[PDB]
C-alpha cells in the first residue's frame, strides 16, 4: 500500500540566471517547485523546493524575441487589450519575464498558486540572505 | 598602419593614434590577428553568412586605423541667393530661407568649419560620425529639384 510522505522541510535553492535561456531555465525551475525531483514526491501535498533566482535581468533568449515576443494583458474594459514586447518588460520590471514563463508551466489548480509563492525572483543578484542559499546550476 | 596602436578584447578592438582613439566593436566569431606593423582578420569558415561578416570587420577596422591616421572630413556647397553659412563659436549657424535662421550643435568628436559662407567642411576621427553630420546639414535644406539652391555635396546638381 504505497508510501505517503510525512511533514518534510523546505529545501531552499539558489539558481543563477545570467546566460541561461528563458524557457529552458523555467522548465527545470518548476520541476523543483513541484517536488517532482524528490522521490518522496506526492501530488496532493505540495513540497517542492524554495527556488530563488538572481540576476534574471541577464536572461538570454534566442532570435528576435526581444522585439517580437509580445505579452498580452486584457483589462476588463472595452479596447482594454494592452500588449507589451519583451524588450519593454526587461527594460522595466524584468523578473516579470522569468516569473510568468514559470507560472505558465505550473499546474492550474490552487496549490499551483501555492507553488508560485515558493518562487522568489530578482535581479541583482543578492536576495534577502535568509539562511539556505545552496547554489545550483 | 604606422604610428597606430591596435589592440584586442572579447568582441571589440582599440585603435590609438595621433588623433586620439576609438572603440571598434566587431564580429565575435572573427579573428583580430595582430601582426608587427600590420593587423588582420580571419573567418572560421566559408559560408555565405561568414563571408559577409569577414569583409565588414576587414574594412571596419581599417577605417578605424585610418581615422586616427589623418581623420576624415567632407565638403558642403551652399547654393542659392540668401543661403549662406556662418561659423559662430564652435557651432554652425546657417541661414537658407526659413524666417528663423537654423543653428547646428557641434557634436563631440566632430569639428566643422566655414572657410567661406559658400563652403562647410566637417572634420572628424570617425567615418561614421562624419557621415551623419554631413547629411544632417544637407538635410537642413535638400537641393531644389527645380532649381539650384540649398546644400550640396560634390555630387551633380538635380536640375
Amino acid at each position: 500500500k504505497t508510501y505517503v510522505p510525512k511533514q518534510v522541510e523546505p529545501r531552499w535553492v539558489l539558481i543563477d540566471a545570467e546566460g541561461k535561456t528563458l524557457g529552458r531555465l523555467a522548465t527545470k525551475i518548476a520541476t523543483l517547485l513541484r517536488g517532482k525531483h524528490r522521490p518522496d514526491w506526492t501530488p496532493n501535498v505540495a513540497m517542492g523546493d524554495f527556488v530563488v533566482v538572481v540576476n534574471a535581468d541577464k536572461i538570454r533568449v534566442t532570435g528576435k524575441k526581444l522585439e517580437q515576443k509580445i505579452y498580452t494583458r486584457y483589462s476588463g474594459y472595452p479596447g482594454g487589450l494592452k500588449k507589451i514586447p519583451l524588450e519593454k518588460m526587461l527594460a522595466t520590471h524584468p523578473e516579470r519575464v522569468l516569473e510568468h514563463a514559470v507560472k505558465g508551466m505550473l499546474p492550474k489548480g490552487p496549490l499551483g498558486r501555492r507553488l508560485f509563492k515558493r518562487l522568489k525572483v530578482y535581479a541583482g543578484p543578492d536576495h534577502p540572505h535568509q539562511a539556505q542559499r545552496p547554489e545550483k546550476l | 598602419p604606422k604610428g597606430v596602436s591596435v589592440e584586442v578584447a572579447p568582441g571589440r578592438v582599440k585603435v590609438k593614434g595621433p588623433k586620439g582613439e576609438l572603440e571598434v566593436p566587431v564580429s565575435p566569431e572573427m579573428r583580430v590577428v595582430v601582426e608587427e606593423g600590420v593587423v588582420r582578420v580571419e573567418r572560421p569558415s566559408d559560408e555565405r553568412r561568414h563571408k559577409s561578416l569577414h569583409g565588414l570587420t576587414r574594412t571596419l577596422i581599417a577605417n578605424a586605423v585610418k581615422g586616427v591616421s589623418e581623420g576624415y572630413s567632407k565638403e558642403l556647397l551652399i547654393k542659392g541667393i540668401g543661403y549662406r553659412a556662418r561659423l559662430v563659436g564652435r557651432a554652425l549657424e546657417l541661414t537658407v530661407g526659413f524666417s528663423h535662421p537654423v543653428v547646428v550643435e557641434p557634436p563631440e568628436g566632430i569639428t566643422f568649419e566655414v572657410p567661406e559662407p559658400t563652403r562647410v567642411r566637417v572634420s572628424g576621427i570617425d567615418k561614421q560620425k562624419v557621415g551623419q553630420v554631413a547629411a544632417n546639414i544637407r538635410a537642413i535644406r535638400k537641393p531644389s529639384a527645380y532649381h539650384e539652391k540649398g546644400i550640396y555635396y560634390a555630387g551633380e546638381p538635380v536640375r
Partner: protein, 204 residues
C-alpha cells in the same frame, strides 16, 4: 513645486484696469510643515502641511505626539504636497505672486444618486410622440446574443459628484498677505467653506 492648503470662501469680481474679472476667494491660511518626506526613509519627496488650528479636546488622540515631535500647534487637517521641500517652517499665500498660475484640487458638490440624463448629459427620449415612460431613460445598453453582456465602463445612472476634482491652470490674480487670501479666476471645485489645496501648474 509650490503648494499650500486653503478653504474656498466664496467668489465675486474685481476690475483689472478697465475690464471686469470674476474671481474665487481661496484662503490659504498659515500652514505649518508637520513632517518632511525624503527618499532616505519614505521613498519619495513631499511635505506634510498642516492647516487650521484645533482645541486639544479632540486631539486627545496621540496625534498630540505627532504634533509634539515637531513642536507645532495641533491643527485640524493635514495633507501632503508632493515633490515640494520648502524651508523648515511655514508656507503662506506668499509662495504665490500675482500673474502666476495654479492648479487647484477640491471635492465637488455632492449630487447624490444621479439620473443618467445629468450624470452623463445624455439625451433620453421624446417629451411627446409616445412611450411616455422613457423620457429621461438611457435607451438600449447593448446588442443581441453577441457580445451578450455589457462593457465595464458603461455610462449608467449612479452617484455623481462629491468626487475629487482638480481644475487646471487658473491664474492667480491677487494675493492679500494681510489676511491670507488667494485670488484666482473663479472656477474652483467644492462649495463655500470647503477644503481645497492649491499648487503650481503644468504649463511646463
Amino acid at each position: 513645486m509650490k503648494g499650500i492648503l486653503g478653504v474656498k470662501v466664496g467668489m465675486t469680481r474685481i476690475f483689472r484696469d478697465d475690464r471686469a474679472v470674476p474671481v474665487t476667494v481661496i484662503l490659504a491660511g498659515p500652514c505649518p510643515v508637520v513632517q518632511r518626506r525624503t527618499p532616505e526613509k519614505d521613498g519619495y519627496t513631499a511635505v506634510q502641511l498642516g492647516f487650521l488650528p484645533q482645541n486639544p479636546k479632540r486631539v486627545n488622540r496621540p496625534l498630540k505626539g505627532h504634533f509634539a515631535k515637531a513642536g507645532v500647534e495641533p491643527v485640524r487637517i493635514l495633507r501632503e504636497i508632493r515633490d515640494f521641500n520648502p524651508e523648515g517652517d511655514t508656507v503662506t499665500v506668499e509662495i504665490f505672486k500675482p500673474g502666476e498660475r495654479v492648479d487647484v484640487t477640491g471635492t465637488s458638490k455632492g449630487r447624490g444618486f444621479a439620473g443618467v440624463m445629468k450624470r452623463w448629459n445624455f439625451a433620453g427620449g421624446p417629451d411627446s410622440h409616445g412611450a411616455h415612460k422613457i423620457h429621461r431613460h438611457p435607451g438600449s445598453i447593448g446588442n443581441r446574443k453577441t457580445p451578450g453582456r455589457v462593457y465595464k465602463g458603461k455610462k449608467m445612472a449612479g452617484h455623481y459628484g462629491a468626487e475629487r476634482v482638480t481644475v487646471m491652470n487658473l491664474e492667480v490674480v491677487d494675493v492679500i498677505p494681510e489676511e491670507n487670501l488667494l485670488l484666482v479666476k473663479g472656477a474652483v471645485p467644492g462649495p463655500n467653506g470647503g477644503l481645497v489645496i492649491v499648487r503650481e501648474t503644468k504649463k511646463a
